[PDB]
């Protein structure tokens, strides 16, 4: 019921297609030639056709029925049935895969030839010689494939320079804090960045502002909330846009002037490139897969965020995440909730090693949230307890509810290590820039 | 011959869908999200579908060629069907058609199940048959069940407040909890003999007075006793008097008066030992199906076992997950009691913390709200010239406390509150009745 080579006549069609696509798009010939060669073709008229195409492109001459019929080599003549059939073919875009597949077919051809060859070669024997022949054939095929190969650096260097000079004519994605961007130099692509903060310090609120920092830069963001639901996460961001306190927004009552700015920021964010996934306690591979999926769906995606990571090993999580960071070529930011052993210490300032099956290392940039007032309060309480054994808030509210906060830049790979002071607003749970 | 009419139509529909995906490569996602290769009646269609998936995953476009070369080379689809697929007239928004084919597949699996159970009766273990019904039911139930997406929920949330939850019983706590919101998983970790079993019942009563059906699951303790505490709190009679049996004219009267009063309330019980998490899920599905009115559930209590051997013999980490699952499933808030590990008292400050709940396979996190019970006096007594000074100063206190009414200061730590506030509430505790008196901040202290 099955006849070999039936697929092959179909395989010819692909060649026809690709050629037609290049007919319509002359520039495509380069990206074709970079992979396929005239000998790589099964059907000869197609291969020689390709040869002619190359000879024409090198002299910067367009490719068409007129240009093709005239520049005939007069050594071999394309059959009329085929000649017309090529141009008659329906034009198709995204032919890159077709090129790859024709390369597959040619590869298969090299396979059938070599496979038969080596056997007969081995038949005669010096079997060691046959082994060496196998090795040489192996190297030949290996070089032939060019799948996940090496070379070459010098080419990509020029483009990497032409990209930075174009912006020189910001290096990465804007953070939101100018203080921080002096050290970070913006969010560079494929860079794994992590923020470890204690609960209720305003971690969840702080993240959203940096999200907005990317949104005004029109860069696609994928958001991952495991523990929390999406709705609230949106609510904080609106709390930061409309400049309205959290409670009034949460309860429901809004006057004439606030619902207006609310609705004004509403569609503003609605049109912004924003995606959500509120499903609880997702696995790392599922993350990799879904990110592959969304990046496949949307090219525009330039950054990713996750809130937040749970303690169970952290090293492999950070590793696969760095892997995906360089894979999708975008900087990934995840939130971590540090261990309680941080507060047992006298100086309650967060340090790199506080989140202890091993300690996390893979992160390129690590940021800590520290509120100078919250730990001052406990020391004052301790001193009071010490005095028994031996109003300030309302003033704070009347000032404008501004407290001193520090964003520790403890880790910066091949950069600077420092601390930046930022004013924190308690009711809006927002970090003011200055 | 209506069956084969449906058959001849379904072949057509499958083909249609396949062709539509041929022209629109991207639709494969929403198809796979619903349908699977086995879901197809006509085998070549399923095979075709499988191949399509394999092509999409390597991000390769879909057409006549891509399929023909990338044949599984285990089986080759007959040409007659293959071409007929392409020949099919493309129609948009086939989501309804997809739904219809899913319908057909559903039916297909159903008939098999029906036959299975039919033949099962020949044996004549009916309990086994019951279990088979339950498992098949679970199978069918499980089989059945971006910005614009979140916008709609954002509307459905505010419309709900315009249209908050189940009352706790304590206004202090309700200031933080904002009542028991539906589908929200709430956990309580308390030390033994603190009056945990006694405390739960008050909140049970708070929901019963809200006329919402409450389901109770007691593994460790018996139902009868659990009711006895509730009557101890209703009739305001000491536990021992109610337990021993002797009651005077005024106590048996108020007793009988509260008896039928509670007897008519929507209350359900399960005192069976060592129920499994899945067994819980099933039983709650059964009771919610039996009674729509039930809005809340309570459990007392699970013990924590850490390691690895704790996964097969029966983990709370995944158990809490399955419980959150069921919480959102029946859309009602679930409350479970937890007995913390002894390492809590090894610490200098015997105040309970979130990480005290360690398990085999991680620390519990899935819980939305976590509450702690702390009695400031019970650890103080045990913690309790200078020695003589103390000896006469504190001996003074003991007889004094007893005559007052055995009222002690108690703290209910609200350590965890999802999208809310973290704080502590002070309430007066009564030792003999083992009851927590409810009182606001302005009235307290």
Curated annotation (Swiss-Prot), chain A:
<feature type="region of interest" description="Hairpin domain">
    <location>
        <begin position="95"/>
        <end position="143"/>
    </location>
</feature>
<dbReference type="InterPro" id="IPR027417">
    <property type="entry name" value="P-loop_NTPase"/>
</dbReference>
<dbReference type="InterPro" id="IPR016136">
    <property type="entry name" value="DNA_helicase_N/primase_C"/>
</dbReference>
<feature type="region of interest" description="Linker">
    <location>
        <begin position="144"/>
        <end position="169"/>
    </location>
</feature>
<dbReference type="InterPro" id="IPR007693">
    <property type="entry name" value="DNA_helicase_DnaB-like_N"/>
</dbReference>
<comment type="similarity">
    <text>Belongs to the helicase family. DnaB subfamily.</text>
</comment>
<dbReference type="GO" id="GO:0006269">
    <property type="term" value="P:DNA replication, synthesis of primer"/>
</dbReference>
<feature type="binding site">
    <location>
        <begin position="197"/>
        <end position="204"/>
    </location>
    <ligand>
        <name>ATP</name>
    </ligand>
</feature>
<keyword id="KW-0413">Isomerase</keyword>
<feature type="region of interest" description="Head domain">
    <location>
        <begin position="2"/>
        <end position="94"/>
    </location>
</feature>
<dbReference type="InterPro" id="IPR007692">
    <property type="entry name" value="DNA_helicase_DnaB"/>
</dbReference>
<keyword id="KW-0460">Magnesium</keyword>
<feature type="region of interest" description="HPI">
    <location>
        <begin position="371"/>
        <end position="400"/>
    </location>
</feature>
<dbReference type="GO" id="GO:0006260">
    <property type="term" value="P:DNA replication"/>
</dbReference>
<keyword id="KW-0547">Nucleotide-binding</keyword>
<comment type="subunit">
    <text>Homohexamer. Dodecamer formed by 2 stacked hexameric rings. Binds ssDNA as a dodecamer in the presence of ATP, in the presence of non-hyrolyzable AMPPMP binds ssDNA as a hexamer. Binds DnaG primase; when the C-terminus of DnaG (residues 415-559) binds the dodecamer dissociates into a hexamer, which can bind up to 3 DnaG fragments.</text>
</comment>
<dbReference type="InterPro" id="IPR007694">
    <property type="entry name" value="DNA_helicase_DnaB-like_C"/>
</dbReference>
<feature type="domain" description="SF4 helicase">
    <location>
        <begin position="170"/>
        <end position="434"/>
    </location>
</feature>
<feature type="region of interest" description="ATPase domain">
    <location>
        <begin position="170"/>
        <end position="434"/>
    </location>
</feature>
<keyword id="KW-0378">Hydrolase</keyword>
<dbReference type="GO" id="GO:0043139">
    <property type="term" value="F:5'-3' DNA helicase activity"/>
</dbReference>
<dbReference type="GO" id="GO:0003678">
    <property type="term" value="F:DNA helicase activity"/>
</dbReference>
<keyword id="KW-0238">DNA-binding</keyword>
<keyword id="KW-0347">Helicase</keyword>
<dbReference type="GO" id="GO:0005524">
    <property type="term" value="F:ATP binding"/>
</dbReference>
<dbReference type="GO" id="GO:0016887">
    <property type="term" value="F:ATP hydrolysis activity"/>
</dbReference>
<keyword id="KW-0235">DNA replication</keyword>
<dbReference type="Pfam" id="PF00772">
    <property type="entry name" value="DnaB"/>
</dbReference>
<dbReference type="Pfam" id="PF03796">
    <property type="entry name" value="DnaB_C"/>
</dbReference>
<dbReference type="GO" id="GO:0005829">
    <property type="term" value="C:cytosol"/>
</dbReference>
<dbReference type="InterPro" id="IPR036185">
    <property type="entry name" value="DNA_heli_DnaB-like_N_sf"/>
</dbReference>
<feature type="region of interest" description="N-terminal domain">
    <location>
        <begin position="2"/>
        <end position="144"/>
    </location>
</feature>
<protein>
    <recommendedName>
        <fullName>Replicative DNA helicase DnaB</fullName>
        <ecNumber>5.6.2.3</ecNumber>
    </recommendedName>
</protein>
<dbReference type="GO" id="GO:0042802">
    <property type="term" value="F:identical protein binding"/>
</dbReference>
<dbReference type="GO" id="GO:0003677">
    <property type="term" value="F:DNA binding"/>
</dbReference>
<keyword id="KW-0639">Primosome</keyword>
<comment type="function">
    <text>The main replicative DNA helicase, it participates in initiation and elongation during chromosome replication. Travels ahead of the DNA replisome, separating dsDNA into templates for DNA synthesis. An ATP-dependent 5'-3' DNA helicase that prefers 5'-tailed substrates (have a 5' single-stranded (ss)DNA tail). ATP, GTP and UTP are equally active for helicase activity in vitro, while dATP and CTP are less active. Its DNA-dependent ATPase activity is stimulated by ssDNA. Binds ss- but not double-stranded (ds)DNA. Rescues a temperature-sensitive E.coli dnaB mutation in vivo.</text>
</comment>
<dbReference type="GO" id="GO:1990077">
    <property type="term" value="C:primosome complex"/>
</dbReference>
<keyword id="KW-0067">ATP-binding</keyword>
